[PDB]
Design a protein around this ligand. Structure first.
Ligand SMILES: CC(C)(COP(=O)(O)OP(=O)(O)OC[C@H]1O[C@@H](n2cnc3c(N)ncnc32)[C@H](O)[C@@H]1OP(=O)(O)O)[C@@H](O)C(=O)NCCC(=O)NCCC[N+](=O)[O-]
Ligand SMILES: CC(C)(COP(=O)(O)OP(=O)(O)OC[C@H]1O[C@@H](n2cnc3c(N)ncnc32)[C@H](O)[C@@H]1OP(=O)(O)O)[C@@H](O)C(=O)NCCC(=O)NCCC[N+](=O)[O-]
Lengths: 435, 435
């Protein structure tokens, strides 16, 4: 009765027409300029991509198809007896642009349970990886290796007409989402629960719940945390490194598996998703040097040492946001409700009072406020997930939702190869006169 | 006596100063505008990046630090008794901006021989991969898995001051270049020469020569072809999918292994590097349908069928070039000298007379001329490398030279995170009025 694929089939042609006409009227309209400083500055401030699923406001934070986090929390379907939004529902919203019914949500849950299966070659590879190989590397290689299963890759090789790309992208996307938790959980078990098994998928549970069972966690509040985590880490517009990388690779017609694996390699960078892990490592050294209950002046000192040593303070700052990330606020509120007295949380809370002032004093950061990565690990640690090198894997799993939702649209809308023009310093100087 | 690392140590500070001053004077100078059509069109025509190593001219083709291909052919050091430029020399040029001496070239050759070694976990993974897993996927996963060895990753984790990033990038870059041929050759042997071994590196040979020996080819002309191939596939400015992907991932501080693997995933796309393989598959179906010696009218028909079926004609067209790719011309000239009567070459030559006219007649392609991918496989096939699904691996190996040369510079120059702003259609319409 419910079939997302049938819903998209109706939506596609209309969006195609609307963009066609808009472009007819305003294709040559200028929306901005490019300066020397923007080229040298990693395109900061350049409007360079169309990405439909979410849009980030520098002051207000992210909107998912027009809704803020508080709105989603409020509108999206929850688990029975639950309080946090189910990521399945967030997926529906991103893809269709409409708030799903609970019935629609349960269909997604079933679909993902049905498609969850790992090929033996992938199981083998994971089982043979050494324990010093970083979890994000293990994740990316496994996803790359899953491409033997790609339906898009297969149809392409068979000569499918370009107009049908979206259909095969959608299949691969739902298959990949389905398989992610099995990949991620097998890594977790092999690394940290050596000799145990992930077990099997229960077609009757929500995606987050099967995931936490495979991770081996029983706490019900942990399940709720996982639901919220996976929902809020989902998408963050198109120019962030992971999304942009998936977009750019997907534009060459690489299949969703290859596109998502490349994105993971970008998420593994210390300036991107790896910050969630870095925050915890920095806090551990903190508590270690200073010891649990530090004074304000000592925290300052410690922050300064980092800055003075030519390092960044993880979890603070943003390329676009200019105010406190609502994703951070959202986490804080969860902590205040569930683990108000945890000492680490307490430390994280104290840094909120300090860090921004030091960054401001330093005068370099454009945004001295915290970002999502500053509050995520702390929540995880409380529930027993102390393996900090694994944190980014959770972010990867969530991020699949948003990048794949857009990927289906990029192909539906016929977006071409992403290929800007580059310039050398010497050539740019000439273009101007030099300096 | 020769030490590239010492050469870079002197060059870095000067370039830093020159860019600093230029930016002081012209940072706010506008170099272009952004239109609606550019955002929807994968940034076509947008000047968006600084990339130092090579610059592409739409009419004249690529220049490597200011030199054209014919110039390189002429200036770069050759093998003893050789005619084609050694890629080692091309690497020196890209990195320093100066033409190396043969003595400098031999140092690179030795250095790469010395650093060539594979960790057992990587050997194991390759040996367990199934034969239906595409060679490019196998390559990317192995490179990702090599990241356990990253020196950059390690130094970062130790808190290295940002000013020294370049030094560790350079080490990883030389290590990765060194190891590429062993990875690539082991895949080749496992897939197509099952039961045999790649053997060992001869510290006395050039990089291309150790590579062809590991691939198992004895023909001396094959060695010369490999030298030229690896030289010309090296770099193609910064906005091409593979280079741009390495640049973007590297900008988040992911190590060179992760950055290069992500790039490979972009090179594996049918619209990018996979075209070299696609051309051969299309030619095989051609010769199969029509049979070896086709007439012009029949080739036309065959081209039309492709176009009419909603597919691209591989090997023709470009996002930036507007005339015949000099890399194509360069290949043709090699063919004319060495394999003038090969029937496939002959076919490729015939298509040159036909394809462009049909594309022009169709009126959609901006560039109806051939690109590099249209002529590369044919050369390979002649020498016995008939495994067309493997062709893109060779391109990956070459491409490492250029993207890694730039990567060292990106970190030396302190380029920040690549993070443009995205927009939804709805938001863009609002920005204007709509349409
Ligand atoms: C997010 C980030 C990369 C944004 O980069 P940009 O847009 O280039 O930041 P911005 O324009 O503020 O840079 C101005 C200067 O302040 C410096 N600065 C910015 N944020 C920080 C920070 N948290 N700690 C120290 N220095 C900083 C920045 O490195 C730059 O210095 P320099 O000119 O010497 O290169 C940067 O804020 C950062 O490195 N933050 C710390 C790492 C982090 O938390 N990453 C996670 C972000 C979220 N995610 O991606 O999952
Ligand atoms: C290289 C390529 C992606 C450039 O893309 P663009 O800059 O978007 O090309 P362009 O501006 O000419 O596109 C105009 C129209 O012509 C179409 N067109 C362009 N080249 C081709 C071609 N070779 N065969 C059929 N149609 C083509 C193109 O798809 C587009 O159609 P639509 O509007 O319906 O989307 C495109 O020429 C192509 O698909 N070529 C064939 C694949 C190929 O040879 N790739 C290898 C390139 C080199 N490399 O990357 O290693």
């Amino acid at each position: 009765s419910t079939n997302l694929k049938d819903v998209l089939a109706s939506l596609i042609p209309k969006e195609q027409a609307r963009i066609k006409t808009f472009r007819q009227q305003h294709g040559n309209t200028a929306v901005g300029q490019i300066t020397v400083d923007m080229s040298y500055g990693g395109m900061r401030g350049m409007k360079g991509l169309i990405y439909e699923t979410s849009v980030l406001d520098p002051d207000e934070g992210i909107r998912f198809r027009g809704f803020s986090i508080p709105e989603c929390q409020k509108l999206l379907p929850k688990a029975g007896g639950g309080e946090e939004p189910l990521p399945e529902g967030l997926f529906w919203l991103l893809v269709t642009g409409q708030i799903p019914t609970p019935e629609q949500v349960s269909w997604v849950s079933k679909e993902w349970a049905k498609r969850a299966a790992l090929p033996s070659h992938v199981v083998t590879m994971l089982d043979n990886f050494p324990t010093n190989l970083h979890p994000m590397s293990q994740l990316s290689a496994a996803i790359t290796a899953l491409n033997s299963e790609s339906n898009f890759a297969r149809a392409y090789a068979e000569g499918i007409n370009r107009t049908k790309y979206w259909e095969f992208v959608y299949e691969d996307a739902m298959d990949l989402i389905a398989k992610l938790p099995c990949v991620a959980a097998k890594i977790y078990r092999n690394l940290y629960r050596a000799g145990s098994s992930i077990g099997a998928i229960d077609s009757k549970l929500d995606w987050s719940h099967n995931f936490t069972n495979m991770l081996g966690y029983t706490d019900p509040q942990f399940t709720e945390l996982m639901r919220l985590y996976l929902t809020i880490h989902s998408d963050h517009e198109g120019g962030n490194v992971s999304a942009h990388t998936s977009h750019l690779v997907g534009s060459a017609l690489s299949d969703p598996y290859l596109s998502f694996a490349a994105a993971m390699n970008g998420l593994a960078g210390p300036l991107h998703g790896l910050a969630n892990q870095e925050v915890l490592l920095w806090l551990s050294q903190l508590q270690k040097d200073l010891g649990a209950d530090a004074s304000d002046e000592k925290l300052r000192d410690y922050i300064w040492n980092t800055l003075n040593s030519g390092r960044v303070v993880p979890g603070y700052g943003h390329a676009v946001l200019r105010k406190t990330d609502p994703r951070y606020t959202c986490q804080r509120e969860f902590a205040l409700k569930h683990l108000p007295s945890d000492p680490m949380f307490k430390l994280v809370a104290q840094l909120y009072k300090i860090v921004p002032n030091v960054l401001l004093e330093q005068g370099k950061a454009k945004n001295p406020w915290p970002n999502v990565d500053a509050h995520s690990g702390v929540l995880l640690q409380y529930y027993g997930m102390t393996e900090m090198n694994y944190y980014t894997v959770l972010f990867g799993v969530s991020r699949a939702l948003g990048v794949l939702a857009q990927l289906i649209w990029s192909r539906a809308l016929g977006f071409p190869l992403e290929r800007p023009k580059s310039m050398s310093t010497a050539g740019l100087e000439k273009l101007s006169a030099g300096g």
